[PDB]
Paper text:
The eukaryotic primase is a heterodimer of catalytic and regulatory subunits that is associated with the catalytic subunit of Pol α and its accessory B subunit in a constitutive heterotetrameric assembly, the Pol α/primase complex. In contrast, the Pol α/primase complex produces longer, composite RNA-DNA primers that result from the concerted enzymatic activities of primase and Pol α. We have determined crystal structures of the catalytic core (349–1258; 910 amino acids) of yeast Pol α in unliganded form (apo), bound to an RNA primer/DNA template duplex (binary complex) and in a productive complex with RNA primer/DNA template and incoming dGTP (ternary complex). The catalytic region of Pol α adopts the universal ‘right-hand' DNA polymerase fold consisting of a palm domain harboring the active site, a fingers domain that interacts with the incoming nucleotide and a thumb domain that grips the primer-template duplex.
For structural studies of the ternary complex, we used a polymerase mutant (D998N) with attenuated catalytic activity. The RNA primer–DNA template helix bound to Pol α adopts overall an A-DNA conformation. The majority of the contacts of the polymerase with the primer/template duplex takes place within a region of 7 bp from the 3′-terminus of the templated primer. The interactions between the thumb domain and the RNA primer are concentrated in a contiguous region of five nucleotides, from position two to six of the RNA primer and involve solely the ribose and phosphate moieties of the RNA backbone. The contiguous pair of invariant arginine residues 1075 and 1076 straddles the ribose-phosphate backbone between nucleotides three and four from the 3′-end of the RNA primer. The side chain of Arg1075 extends into the minor groove and packs its guanidinium moiety against the ribose sugar of Ade4, thus engaging in an interaction that matches closely the contact made by the equivalent Arg839 of yeast Pol δ with the DNA primer. However, in the case of Pol α the close contact with Arg1075 induces a local rearrangement of the RNA conformation, which includes a B-DNA C2′-endo ribose pucker for Ade4 and unstacking between the aromatic bases of nucleotides four and five.
Numbering used by the authors: 349 to 506, 511 to 676, 681 to 815, 841 to 1174, 1188 to 1242
The structure:
DNA sequence: TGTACCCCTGCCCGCC
């Protein structure tokens, strides 16, 4: 009747007011975009009186000063007992502050914040004087992520949205308890570009728009869901005219609508109009955030498009004057309103760790198990300004790419997972989709603390885990790997480490503090971490009884995502730029960790058990058993003995290795025993740290390492197994020298963290030279890029891009000398070093 | 206005 109900998704700050973008059900319950403009929000300032003065003394003093300063008729202010438990010195654990409410929008001095160090005769500190509008709203009104909102007193008369409402009382908006959510209008994008040798900038040739008007995150997303619409927007690449027969052939072979334009300006103008109309909640894509959104923005800026703001939901008539590495924030604000669901950004990458480059094709293969052979489209080639079939081919590649981005997006549950994490943290959905962890920690703490009458802080360096020196070599007996479930998170709870409970010297953050006595009640941090580990426990419970393989994978991501979250809770204690940075606390967590790992080793030593290796939270035990169950007895026995030492913290049997080959620290190969339904036990090769597992080692090298390990660890006569390996390698030598191997098996990946320019000794680095050639060719390469290349027949002077090599026309052949020495010999030598009766010279001979 | 979990351990490259 009078209660206006909106489901918020994103926000934006403007003119000292807060704006929420969301979805609304009308009388027929149909869902449309809406934009609320919340006014009358205030900052909760807290003045701290000196020893001898009281909140009353302060009020008498500043309330008139502030009224004059900001020209206010009246200012709400009351005394309030608040607790401080953070790194500042000279702040009492609890005091009577004068809580003052200073509206963000004031008649005068609207943006003159009160400095926290402001001193006076009555007070000496002032908390919460710089807090940001969004924070103040979400905290005061207890909003915990994307949720339904009851908004009373909605003014409709006083954006690219259907509805536009404004409220003058923040108190009017209140969260509902409804856990169901609207359907989301998703619009996947795919943009093809070409570089201009004139200005050295990237221009847009085509854009594909795959709409999915009803995506419900309540129920699961059906696989391969077909879009409710598909539309491509093509521009000429070289000349102003396409090739005769493009339209006809397009509607004959290409899926969905295809509309041709005369120049770019026109194409983008249509694109913007289309966004405004479709008005989607989420924008799917691959490398949107870090490449294509940036390009799109600059082009619209250069071509002087008026409807550029269409990308977002806020109507901007003018471009941010500072536009032209701040483009990050700028673009995020312009997109304010529509969630950017990039599957290849940090958030996406964290859900798909099995990838080495996160190329769209690789991501498709990994997450969907479907193979797609990518096509290198270079619109610089006149092949596309003349041949018509080439053009239709490129467009088709772009359609498939857009479709793949969307599918993978739904497959990895990017939207469902991020939303849930956002509701857990109480921050914004967009921010979580960006791939933040400091933000989700910051906000979960902001809420938990504020809810319990705590003052929140205004807006290597220590020793880590313990890693034992391994018993480097092979262990033919059954080995046990005992692991501590969520070591650090569990430690926090065990010894009750928290901002509120741990005594620490705030004059020296490098001074190790000490666990609090059992008398002290459980703090904030252990409580939240408690809930986190509970959630991961429940998800791993469901994963153990899931029939579908696809759903089980989907659960594995979910549990290691909640794992990342809880671990991040700890990390942010040691994150210098964390709002809740507490070096001493982190220090203490790692400390008790090491202590516990020692005690775990010693406990085994006393039982005359062999501790062959350990890393942070695990220990490996050579039991001297020839069978599984006999080791398992010693395992469960040792388990019972350590669990008695701790209240919450508990060790368990992680894996069992029929045979273990320790190479170094953090590197080893072993044979895991996996039990089946009918008690059947099988063997699987597990590897850690070894060269084969790195991206700088080609697929050939990987296969070689895997075979060598399989036979070496296989129950075969030691000298006979060695023989089998030598022979295998003699054969590989011939295959590589003659060139009887597919070039794809030679490919090497290496991510440049810096720009290829910022590499002084880059002349030696092959990946750098390759990135330089790529850029010259017109390919977008930048910090974070992953470069795939091959050494052909100085090493760096002979390294070329993979795609350039797979072009027979270029006649590029891999250098067998390099790959035999570095890619095959080096790793196998490191694989077999500590193995009995291994001969290094015999190996060197078998190759060169 | 303006982001970004922690530390541990090897392998390149160069130099003292
Ligand atoms: N800050 C931070 N700490 C981590 C991270 N990964 C691991 N750690 C630390 C904290 C963990 O408690 C400890 C154990 O690491 P593990 O990889 O074995 O996973 P964890 O023990 O947390 O869970 P699990 O054994 O799989 O049940 O190492 C991380 O990504 N960030």
């Amino acid at each position: 009747t009078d209660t206006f109900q909106m489901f918020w998704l994103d926000y934006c700050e403007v003119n000292n007011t807060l704006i929420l973008f969301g979805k609304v059900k009308l009388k027929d319950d149909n869902c449309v975009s809406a934009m609320v403009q919340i006014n009358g929000l205030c900052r909760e300032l807290f003045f701290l009186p000196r020893e001898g003065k009281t909140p009353t003394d302060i009020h008498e003093e500043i309330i008139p000063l502030l009224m004059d300063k900001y020209g206010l008729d009246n200012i709400r202010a009351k005394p309030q007992k608040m607790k401080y438990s953070f790194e500042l010195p000279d702040i009492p654990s609890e005091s009577d502050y004068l809580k003052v409410l200073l509206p963000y929008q004031t008649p005068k001095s609207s943006r003159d914040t009160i400095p926290s160090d402001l001193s006076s005769d009555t007070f000496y500190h002032v908390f919460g004087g710089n807090s940001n509008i969004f924070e103040s709203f979400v905290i005061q009104n207890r909003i915990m992520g994307p949720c339904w909102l009851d908004i009373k007193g909605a003014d409709f008369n006083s954006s690219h949205c259907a509805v536009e409402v404004s409220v003058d009382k923040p108190q009017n908006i209140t969260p509902t308890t409804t856990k169901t959510m609207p359907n989301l209008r998703c619009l996947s994008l795919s943009i093809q570009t070409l570089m201009n040798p004139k200005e050295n900038k990237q221009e847009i040739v085509s854009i594909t728009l795959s709409a999915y008007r009803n995506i419900s995150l309540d129920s699961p997303i059906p696989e391969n869901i077909k879009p409710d619409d598909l539309c491509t927007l093509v521009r000429p690449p070289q000349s102003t005219s396409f090739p005769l027969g493009l339209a006809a052939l397009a509607k004959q072979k290409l899926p969905g609508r295809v509309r041709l334009f005369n120049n770019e300006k026109a194409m983008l103008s249509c694109f913007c109009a289309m966004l405004k109309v479709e008005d989607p909640d989420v924008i799917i894509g691959h490398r949107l955030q870090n490449v294509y959104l940036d390009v799109l923005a600059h082009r619209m800026h250069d071509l002087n498009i008026p409807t550029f703001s269409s990308i977002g939901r806020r109507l901007r008539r003018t471009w941010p004057e500072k536009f032209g590495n701040m483009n990050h924030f700028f673009i995020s604000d312009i997109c304010s309103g529509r969630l950017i669901c990039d599957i290849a950004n940090e958030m996406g990458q964290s859900l798909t760790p099995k990838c080495q480059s996160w190329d769209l094709s690789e991501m498709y293969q990994v997450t969907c198990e479907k193979e797609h052979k990518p096509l290198d489209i270079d619109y610089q080639n006149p092949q596309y300004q003349n041949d018509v079939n080439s053009m239709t081919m490129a467009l088709q590649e772009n359609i498939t790419n857009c479709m793949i981005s969307a599918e993978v997006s739904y497959r990895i549950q990017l939207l469902t997972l991020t939303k849930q994490l956002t509701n857990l943290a109480g921050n914004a959905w967009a921010q979580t989709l960006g791939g933040t962890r400091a933000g989700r920690n910051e906000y979960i703490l902001l809420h938990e603390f504020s809810r319990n009458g705590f003052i929140v802080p205004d807006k290597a360096k220590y020793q880590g885990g313990l890693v034992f020196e391994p018993e480097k070599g092979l262990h033919k007996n059954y080995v046990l790997v005992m692991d501590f479930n969520s070591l650090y998170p569990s430690i926090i709870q065990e010894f009750n480490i928290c901002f509120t409970t741990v005594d620490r010297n705030k004059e020296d953050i490098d001074e190790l503090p000490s666990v609090p006595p059992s008398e002290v009640d459980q703090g904030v941090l252990p409580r939240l971490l408690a809930n986190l580990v509970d959630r991961r426990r429940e998800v791993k419970k469901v994963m153990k009884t899931e029939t579908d393989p696809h759903k089980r994978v989907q659960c594995d991501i979910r549990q290691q995502a909640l794992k990342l979250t809880a671990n991040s809770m700890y990390g942010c204690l040691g994150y210098v730029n964390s709002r809740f940075y507490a070096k001493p606390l982190a220090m203490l967590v790692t400390n008790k960790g090491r202590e516990i790992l020692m005690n775990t080793r010693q406990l085994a030593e006393s039982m005359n058990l062999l501790v062959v290796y350990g890393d942070t939270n695990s220990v490996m035990i050579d039991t001297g058993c020839d069978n599984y169950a006999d080791a398992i007895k010693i395992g469960l026995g040792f388990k019972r003995l350590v669990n008695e030492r701790y209240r919450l913290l508990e060790i368990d049997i992680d894996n069992v290795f029929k045979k273990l080959l320790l190479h170094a620290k953090k590197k080893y190969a072993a044979l895991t025993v996996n039990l089946d339904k009918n008690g059947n036990g099988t063997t699987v090769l597990e590897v850690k740290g070894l060269d084969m597992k790195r991206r700088e080692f080609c697929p050939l090298s990987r296969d070689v390492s895997i075979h060598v390990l399989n036979t070496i660890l296989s129950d075969k006569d030691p000298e006979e197994a060695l023989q089998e390996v030598y022979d295998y390698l003699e054969d590989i030598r011939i295959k590589v020298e003659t060139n009887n191997i597919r070039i794809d098996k030679y490919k090497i990946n290496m991510k440049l963290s810096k720009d290829p320019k910022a590499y002084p000794g880059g002349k030696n680095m092959p990946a750098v030279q390759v990135a330089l050639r790529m850029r010259k060719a017109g390919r977008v390469v930048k910090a974070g890029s992953v470069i795939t290349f091959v050494i052909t027949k100085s090493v760096a002077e002979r390294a070329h891009a993979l795609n350039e090599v797979m072009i027979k026309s270029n006649n590029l052949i891999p250098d067998p000398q390099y790959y035999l020495e570095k890619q095959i010999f080096a790793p196998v030598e490191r694989l077999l070093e500590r193995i009995d009766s291994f001969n290094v010279v015999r190996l060197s001979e078998a190759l060169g």
